[PDB]
């Protein structure tokens, strides 16, 4: 045989997606949650499960506290990460981890101990023969199919922009805004308290997130949309809670994602995502801005609100000089783009030389990743 | 005697200094920021204040956004500059501006509209009897007390080196580099993310600037210092945040000032400050380079890091021929030296003939400053 | 308190007896500085027992239930809620603010409301917030004796100000703009 397939695991704050190198789609997609029972079990012989990992934790949300191992792109709890990776390797893919190389993705700017801890856990516990760490928005450009453009990745943890021209990345132009989907979920809860509906527990946060995913969109003109929603009730929708109660979302549908463009709603003084993209473009040199304007690529699940592409194009066109081409490239499957391009990175023949070997880790320790990746 | 002391106002990107002619030290020194509130006001009954200027803006930095009117030696928002000048004249010095002449400083190379606009503002809004515009690097040579020498001045927005021989300046050898303390502060904010500390807003920029002033120094040898820092944790310091948390920077103490000597860390193609000084010396005539090598003068608050003099002397001695001596003249009170030079300029008997009168301005418009000022 | 008074045998189920239970809670409850030591002390001896007289003349004894009922303020898991206590809520609200203003908020914590009048809330709150906060920051709990009416008293301060005469909602303004004017005029 030779050249065995190397598995790729994309971990974000929201979901974990794992799959083989050659496939165009991941095998397993499941949320990164670890739940533990609150109450005291009373039936003898029911069986004892200490912790719930993955989809069945979303099934049994009532009797558990939902917790997230990743917050803002940084792994806060590492035992939960070991649980997540074990459930990924042995239950979802059911493959031996010590016989395949592993590819992993991470945010651009993060604490430097995170890479070392991932490398140490991947080598010492799972005994993988090789592993590599890559930036998510670089892999998004591989999934795009072009070697020139600026990638704007918005996920559950962070939002980051990076420009790459002719295969060369400019490190000083990288910006990392902290707005993400979980902040939008919290803001949606806060504005849903205005109509009388109260969501406090961790299990109901998933319900609010589903409401956000199903009944939200980005208005093209926000203040016009406010006038239209105040004038009539045509911009109203109904949602059904799991217990049968019916709520009416009404006005709030375009108020939740509008906070992405004006962060002052959350009390943050940082600029919007469109201004972040424009500033990342403007930090580059004069000659490469023309190619960066015409190859802006959207990525991440958070960018699947309907109408975000037209709004982003309008704002960037307003900021940019009038005589240039501005076009926003939005793949219909962009939620998996960080995975998909990563799979392409595991298929190239020249990539076999830059795996981090076990012998190199033994010689240099966990710091070798800072020399080998990026 | 009928002699009225002329106000000397030194305006930089970072701080504004003000005093009288003939005094040893400036009476007023305060940061040049303008702050505005960013939150709701609910305590009805308190007074309303639209903007905060100077030390009061720093005292209440939590609930304000702070903006610098002067960026890279160029003022962008003229209304904030007018507010700063009004606060300087009425709340810091307690003098009537129409009684005294005012001497102002500016960078050597800049847009030509700045001189005309400050001339118009000082002659119309403040009704000063006379005014003059001088270049800061010449005032540093006045403060040194030597007629000939090369002056390098690095502040918060701009760095510039000029050569002067026997009171004659060479305009073609004047060099301007856009590297200063604000870029170093931004780089320190960027590289503090590696240890796990996140600083985003403007108050955090002020905190990082204070950290840089407290705990930064220049290494004589960069590779030796990097190896020493990697070998042991003896080269570490602890800082205390205003909320009580303690941070430990360690390796980042000597990496931030190194960007002054190697601008490739910031993505700039331009060479270092020592290279700029050597190139400015080499652009002069042959038989004045002997006098210019022995009279190198450092100025500005950016040149206040420990170890700058020794490192710059070693680098210039490496570049220069070995047959003759190079010494670096760094006075301990160099940060205010520019202002001191201005005071000497306001004390000379011949300089009473060099003022720009109000009648001359009325005849010649704002363009008289190009004719009557270097 | 009704649920844990059922545990000793006394039954309260009607709406009229809820007022009696409220009076019992107001008279014979306090906050323990250390919960585990107070439970151990109450289990060891009977010095903490108190007697209450019912409106019909019967006499009941509270005993252990004096400090268990207010403890649910600091441990909501007693009530089945998964939320954090009041000390953690205050600390989290402090941590959500900016870095520069946290010291003044630490030094100026003010208690209010009738619930904050159990004997020993101030000391327990100071101890818990001091445990959460860094050591260099010093905690300062402020609780006026007449805190139960403070929400009224500031109102009497608010209506007497000269600026507040321009801050009303006029009858003409309401007549022009419907009942929705209150969102614009009020915070």
């Amino acid at each position: 045989d030779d050249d065995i397939a190397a598995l790729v695991v994309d971990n974000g704050s929201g979901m974990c997606k794992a799959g083989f190198a050659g496939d165009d789609a991941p095998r397993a997609v499941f949320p990164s949650i670890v739940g533990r029972p609150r109450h005291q079990g009373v039936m003898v012989g029911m069986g004892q499960k200490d912790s719930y990992v993955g989809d069945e934790a979303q099934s049994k949300r009532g009797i558990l506290t939902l917790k997230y191992p990743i917050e803002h792109g940084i792994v806060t709890n590492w035992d939960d990460m070991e649980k997540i990776w074990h459930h990924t390797f042995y239950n979802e893919l059911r493959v031996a981890p010590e016989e395949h190389p592993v590819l992993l993705t991470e945010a651009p700017l993060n604490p430097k101990a995170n890479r070392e801890k991932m490398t140490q856990i991947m080598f010492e516990t799972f005994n993988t023969p090789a592993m590599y760490v890559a930036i998510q928005a670089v892999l998004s450009l591989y999934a795009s199919g072009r070697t020139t453009g600026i990638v704007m990745d918005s996920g559950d943890g962070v939002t980051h922009t990076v420009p790459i021209y002719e295969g060369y990345a400019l490190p000083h132009a990288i910006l990392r805004l902290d707005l993400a989907g979980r902040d939008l979920t919290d803001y949606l809860m806060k504005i849903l308290t205005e109509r009388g509906y109260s969501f406090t527990t961790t299990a109901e946060r998933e319900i609010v997130r589903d409401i956000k995913e199903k009944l939200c969109y980005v208005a093209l003109d926000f203040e016009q949309e406010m006038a239209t929603a105040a004038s009539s009730s045509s911009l109203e929708k109904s949602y059904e809670l799991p217990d049968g109660q019916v709520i009416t979302i009404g006005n709030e549908r375009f108020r939740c994602p509008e906070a992405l463009f004006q962060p002052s709603f959350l009390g943050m003084e940082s600029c919007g995502i469109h201004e972040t993209t424009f500033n990342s473009i403007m930090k580059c040199d004069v000659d490469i801005r023309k190619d960066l304007y015409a190859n802006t690529v959207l990525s991440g699940g958070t960018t699947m609100y309907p109408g975000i592409a037209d709004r982003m194009q309008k704002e960037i066109t307003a900021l940019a000089p009038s005589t240039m081409k501005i076009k926003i490239i939005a793949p219909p499957e962009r939620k998996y783009s960080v995975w998909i391009g990563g799979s392409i990175l595991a298929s190239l023949s020249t990539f076999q030389q830059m795996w981090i070997s076990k012998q190199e880790y033994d010689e240099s320790g966990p710091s070798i990743v800072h020399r080998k990746c990026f | 005697d009928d002699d009225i002391a002329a106000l000397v106002v030194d305006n930089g990107s970072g701080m504004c200094k003000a005093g009288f002619a003939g005094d040893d030290a400036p009476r007023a020194v305060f940061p040049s920021i303008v702050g505005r509130p960013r939150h709701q006001g609910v305590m009805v009954g308190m007074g309303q204040k639209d903007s905060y200027v100077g030390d009061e803006a720093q005292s209440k930095r939590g609930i304000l956004t702070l903006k610098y009117p002067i960026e890279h030696g160029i003022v962008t928002n003229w209304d904030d500059m007018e507010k700063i000048w009004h606060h300087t004249f009425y709340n810091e010095l307690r003098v009537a501006p129409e009684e005294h002449p005012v001497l102002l400083t500016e960078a050597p190379l800049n847009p030509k509209a700045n001189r005309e606009k400050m001339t118009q503002i000082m002659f119309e809004t403040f009704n000063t009897p006379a005014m003059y515009v001088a270049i800061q690097a010449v005032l540093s040579l006045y403060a040194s007390g030597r007629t000939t020498g090369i002056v390098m001045d690095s502040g918060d927005g701009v760095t510039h080196t000029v050569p002067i021989y026997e009171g004659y300046a060479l305009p073609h050898a004047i060099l301007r580099l856009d590297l200063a303390g604000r870029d170093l502060t931004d780089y320190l904010m960027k590289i503090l993310t590696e240890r796990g500390y996140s600083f985003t807003t403007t108050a955090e920029r002020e905190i990082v600037r204070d950290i840089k002033e407290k705990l930064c120094y220049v290494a004589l040898d960069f590779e030796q210092e990097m190896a020493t820092a990697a070998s042991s944790s003896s080269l570490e310091k602890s800082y205390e945040l205003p909320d009580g948390q303690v941070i430990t920077i360690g390796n980042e103490r000597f990496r931030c000032p190194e960007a002054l000597f190697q601008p490739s860390f910031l993505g700039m193609e331009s060479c270092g400050i020592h290279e700029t000084t050597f190139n400015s010396i080499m652009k002069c005539d042959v038989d004045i380079r002997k006098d210019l090598y022995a009279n190198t003068v450092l100025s500005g608050g950016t040149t206040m890091y420990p170890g700058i003099a020794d490192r710059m002397q070693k680098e210039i001695t490496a570049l220069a021929p070995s047959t003759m001596k190079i010494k670096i003249i760094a006075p301990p009170e160099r940060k205010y030296s520019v202002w001191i030079g201005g005071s000497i300029l306001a004390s000379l008997s011949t300089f009473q003939q060099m003022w720009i009168s109000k009648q001359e301005y009325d005849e010649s418009g704002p363009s008289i400053v190009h004719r009557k000022c270097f | 308190l009704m649920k844990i008074l059922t545990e000793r045998g006394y039954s309260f189920t009607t709406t009229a007896e809820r007022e009696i239970v409220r009076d019992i809670k107001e008279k014979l409850c306090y906050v323990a500085l250390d919960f585990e030591q107070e439970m151990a002390t109450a289990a060891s001896s009977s010095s903490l027992e108190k007697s209450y007289e019912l409106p019909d003349g019967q006499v009941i004894t509270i005993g252990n239930e004096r400090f268990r009922c207010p403890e649910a303020l600091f441990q909501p898991s007693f009530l089945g809620m998964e939320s954090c206590g009041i000390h953690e809520t205050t600390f989290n609200s402090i941590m959500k603010c900016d870095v520069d203003i946290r010291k003044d908020l630490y030094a100026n914590t003010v208690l209010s409301g009738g619930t904050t009048m159990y004997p020993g809330i101030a000391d327990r709150m100071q101890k818990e917030i001091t445990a959460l906060a860094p050591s260099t920051m010093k905690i300062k709990i402020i609780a006026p004796p007449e805190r139960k009416y403070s929400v009224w008293i500031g109102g009497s301060i608010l209506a007497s100000l000269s600026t507040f005469q321009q801050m009303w909602i006029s009858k003409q303004e309401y007549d022009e703009s419907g009942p929705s004017i209150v969102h614009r005029k009020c915070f």
Binding site: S264, F265 | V42 | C186
Partner: peptide, 19 residues
């Protein structure tokens, strides 16, 4: 299957500002 200007959340400590 003109940009929006920066907005500031309102103040209540003073009633109005006209001239």
């Amino acid at each position: 299957t003109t940009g929006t200007p920066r907005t500031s959340l309102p103040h209540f400590h003073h009633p109005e500002t006209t001239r």
